[PDB]
Ligand binder design. Sequence first.
Ligand SMILES: [Mg+2]
Ligand SMILES: [Mg+2]
Lengths: 119, 57, 238, 49
Amino acid sequence: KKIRTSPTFRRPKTLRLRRQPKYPRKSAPRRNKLDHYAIIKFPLTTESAMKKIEDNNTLVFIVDVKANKHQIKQAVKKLYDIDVAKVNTLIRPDGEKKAYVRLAPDYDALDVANKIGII
Amino acid sequence: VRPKVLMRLSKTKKHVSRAYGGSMCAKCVRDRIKRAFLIEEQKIVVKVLKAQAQSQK
Amino acid sequence: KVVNLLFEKRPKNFGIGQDIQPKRDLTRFVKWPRYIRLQRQRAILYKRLKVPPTINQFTQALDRQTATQLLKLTHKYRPETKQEKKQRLLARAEKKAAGKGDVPTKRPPVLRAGVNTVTTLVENKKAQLVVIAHDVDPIELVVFLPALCRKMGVPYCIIKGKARLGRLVHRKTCTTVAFTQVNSEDKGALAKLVEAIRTNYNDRYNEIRRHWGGNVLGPKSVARITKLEKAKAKELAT
Amino acid sequence: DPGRGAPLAKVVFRDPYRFKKRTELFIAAEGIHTGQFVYCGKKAQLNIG
RNA sequence: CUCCGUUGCCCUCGGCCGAUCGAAAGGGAGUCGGGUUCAGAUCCCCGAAUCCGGAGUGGCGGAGAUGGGCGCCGCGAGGCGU
RNA sequence: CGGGGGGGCGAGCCCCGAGGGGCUCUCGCUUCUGGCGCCAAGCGCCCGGCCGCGCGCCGGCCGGGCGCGACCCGCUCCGGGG
Ligand SMILES: [Mg+2]
Ligand SMILES: [Mg+2]
């Protein structure tokens, strides 16, 4: 005597368990391939890019094409012990992703050019 | 204003402060009031006339 | 007055169109899924149709008073469980190489379970009683058995529940069962059942063999057909 | 209702049973004015609509 | 481990309506002046903005919200008890 | 739904004692007006804690649970064919 108020039968909601696999299904976890040496390929040194460094506190980077801005930002930060105001990406007709990276005002591009070797 | 904009606006821009405020138009509320008597009262008048018909019968 | 004036009544009325209707049980006004609907109207057909004798006999069965003696009787007598089996062997392995053992003992009398086991030892007249489950799924497997049993003059019987018959022998289900021998002391109770059973079965056959058992309509139809015989009685009985 | 000579009428009853309001579409009988209560079913009285 | 969170199960409530795609012209919140290049500019910069989401611990104000009565004590502003 | 059974305001008939009963009908109760109407009141019966009487299924306070309300049984989810 648990009466039926509704005139449908809806399936009873059963218990359903969580995977307790007897092995892992692949041995090891895949080594991460988008790194803080791989996501950035090279800084550009084009005249319209030197002009962009000196005048706008930016750096012009070619970047690995699967990169996001929060990846390009935690890359450029990690490496040229820098910090980044904002990233701003395009895809060159060629498939190379550019990303020109504004560096916070406390902090200069024209110095960090000579550190990374460009100029 | 275009409806998604209503999410920005304050409560008071979207109603007027009443019964059925901001959905219904005064003129229909104040009939809904004085309809809601006379429906109610004349169930009472039928209630007593029924009671008197069964008191007679 | 220990009765606050406010708690009133507000008694509702669920006439058509008056106050909104409440929640009754609807078990007949509900959508019975395709297994249920189906199994429901197997049981109906299986009464509605004209069922054959041989399949009917698998309705009429034992009663509490008889059944419970049977299943008492068997409980002295269930075939060795596993574990219980192991120590029948293990004890003879230690008793053989210690304090003598020819090792035939005396195999104590027990049940006999399956059909093509039973039917052989019914066809051999090696059975005092045979218990048959009624609800067996392909009925094929036990249609004959009663006929066979009465020809050999072997007391057969039809107990309810292939489960509770298949719980004696330690399984899910079982269709038949049999006592070939009994312990001497336990033979008064066996011969008590046997005589009680075969008044009721083996010596009935021309009552069972010619009894069709369905052809029963639905009570909704029956209530209507009978309500026309109060019209036809009360036309020219008045 | 396009491609159809008769006008329809939306008539809101209410579900005798769930707190709600079923609405339907009757083919408008002539003399259906807007604001009519339309009585339906066995015991209903014999008038238009 | 306070209180809160998280999860486990137990009880409780839920009609829908079709696994899914379909607009670079239909539906769809919110960015614009000025500046700048050889080529790009509501895209870069300067300044003014704005939407959506998050804000828990609640960041800070303001509302909820600060009476009245009665009773005392105090000249009176007033203080206290309820 | 089909049977049953409650109800009962009421009609026919039957009975009747004039209280009433039985059988039949009726209902199953919403029609003058762009009104409101769900998640249950009421009664009942119980149990947890806590407080008071102290015998505590006495009484209060706090907190729950089931029954009626919302008759009972079934065998085809309702309808029309065959
Ligand atoms: Mg799409
Ligand atoms: Mg568009």
